[PDB]
Design an enzyme around this catalytic site. Sequence first.
Site, PDB file in Angstrom:
ATOM      1  N   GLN A  30     -52.013  58.515   1.805  1.00 24.63           N
ATOM      2  CA  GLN A  30     -50.812  57.780   1.422  1.00 24.63           C
ATOM      3  C   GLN A  30     -50.266  56.926   2.563  1.00 24.63           C
ATOM      4  OE1 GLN A  30     -48.673  61.448   0.366  1.00 24.63           O
ATOM      5  NE2 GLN A  30     -47.079  60.885   1.842  1.00 24.63           N
ATOM      6  N   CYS A  65     -46.169  60.342  -2.054  1.00 24.46           N
ATOM      7  CA  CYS A  65     -46.813  61.611  -2.375  1.00 24.46           C
ATOM      8  C   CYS A  65     -46.628  61.968  -3.846  1.00 24.46           C
ATOM      9  CB  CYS A  65     -46.269  62.726  -1.478  1.00 24.46           C
ATOM     10  SG  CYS A  65     -44.462  62.785  -1.366  1.00 24.46           S
ATOM     11  N   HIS A 110     -42.388  67.849  -0.639  1.00 27.73           N
ATOM     12  CA  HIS A 110     -43.703  67.204  -0.634  1.00 27.73           C
ATOM     13  C   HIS A 110     -44.522  67.493  -1.884  1.00 27.73           C
ATOM     14  CE1 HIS A 110     -46.944  64.988   1.189  1.00 27.73           C
ATOM     15  NE2 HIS A 110     -47.770  66.012   1.089  1.00 27.73           N
ATOM     16  N   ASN A 162     -53.830  67.404  -1.591  1.00 27.66           N
ATOM     17  CA  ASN A 162     -52.820  66.657  -0.864  1.00 27.66           C
ATOM     18  C   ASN A 162     -53.249  65.201  -0.738  1.00 27.66           C
ATOM     19  OD1 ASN A 162     -50.438  66.268   0.490  1.00 27.66           O
ATOM     20  ND2 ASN A 162     -51.074  67.289   2.385  1.00 27.66           N
TER      21      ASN A 162
END
Lengths: 215, 215
Positions: B19, B25, B162, B182
């Site tokens: 990202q 995110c 997150h 992630n």
Amino acid sequence: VPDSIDYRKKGYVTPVKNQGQCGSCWAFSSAGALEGQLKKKTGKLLALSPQNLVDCVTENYGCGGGYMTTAFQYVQQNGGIDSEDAYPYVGQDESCMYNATAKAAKCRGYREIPVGNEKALKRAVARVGPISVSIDASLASFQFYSRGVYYDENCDRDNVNHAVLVVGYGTQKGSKHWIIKNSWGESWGNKGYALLARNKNNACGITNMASFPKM
Amino acid sequence: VPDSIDYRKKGYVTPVKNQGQCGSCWAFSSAGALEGQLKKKTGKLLALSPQNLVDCVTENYGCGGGYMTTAFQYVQQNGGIDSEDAYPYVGQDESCMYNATAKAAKCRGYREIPVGNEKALKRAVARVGPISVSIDASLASFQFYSRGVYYDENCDRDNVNHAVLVVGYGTQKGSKHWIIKNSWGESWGNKGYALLARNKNNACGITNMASFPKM
Ligand SMILES: *[C@@H]1O[C@H](CO)[C@@H](O)[C@H](O)[C@H]1NC(C)=O
Ligand SMILES: *[C@@H]1O[C@H](CO)[C@@H](O)[C@H](O)[C@H]1NC(C)=O
């Protein structure tokens, strides 16, 4: 429920193909319905493979005939169907060459439209999308179709022998109609399409085998 | 409900991206969930565009933060979302450049998972697919993650900051876990993925914002 609809304008319809010397009309119809429903569920128009159906639907007759419902059931139980790019149409019988990695669409059963009920067919086209149907194509008047709303009282509304894809309905100069997509190429009818007499008491038996897939 | 599942093995998960210097995110998480669901509904794995979300979700903060539910609502009301190829990720704020012709996936609302209920999260992952969640990533122990099942009693199970994508669960050497994807590139954790302590009483608050899209 609208008085008119054209899924060709909504980008639900794949370019007209030619089934050639092969009774794969049911394959193109099924593939067309699945294409429309795939478009409705994703927004992406993608050409699915009728050849996959011709070869892998073991309860149909390949290039010798078949039903659309059985094809939908196939797509469901097999867990997918290939794209046209991955599994091109060659117009002849051959072994099942289904590539599960080339999977591009799924099915979750099918629904049949009540025989004789054009109202339910119109409601279906309105709320679902392009409906796989079958009609009587045997008449030379249909073979020589080119313009207008097709009608012939000699058309068999009881015995049915050719699968096409109803992609919408409307009215042309007073005469109500069904927009049908055929698989005899763009050299037939109105560039592969035809207008069929609607509400003329099940003209050509368009409700004898009307079905659509679920996604 | 299985004792283990890995949607990475089912081909539901897109390659790990980075990202960069942008709080997108939530965009990658939402895009990931929509990708998994698109795979479940079609059988085709296709990279959707987080950039589209960053730019066009006017009730989120672009590269400054956002929620996944709001993104799903966006995809629903806008009537589609673009592919990664059509709308590439550039990692910075810009005007909405949504190409409706590049439409590749749709949404039909979202579902939130009951806060604190990891059981419902596991059932969700089992019956739905990759679930968009959000956790506490602030700890250096998470920044320096590389192997094992991650756990830290200092991890905030109440305040969350997150978004990641739970792509399955299981157990590694006795310790139950959540497999999370992630968006910090493949240079972080286990090639972009991590194992998070499961059933350790909402570790890192993985159930504070667990949501998934409908198709
Ligand atoms: C199967 O089809 C996929 C479609 O993308 C193709 O890339 C691949 O080469 C084919 N592989 C096999 C198993 O034949
Ligand atoms: C929009 O996106 C499509 C994606 O296929 C692309 O082909 C086309 O060139 C774009 N057109 C517009 C309206 O910018």
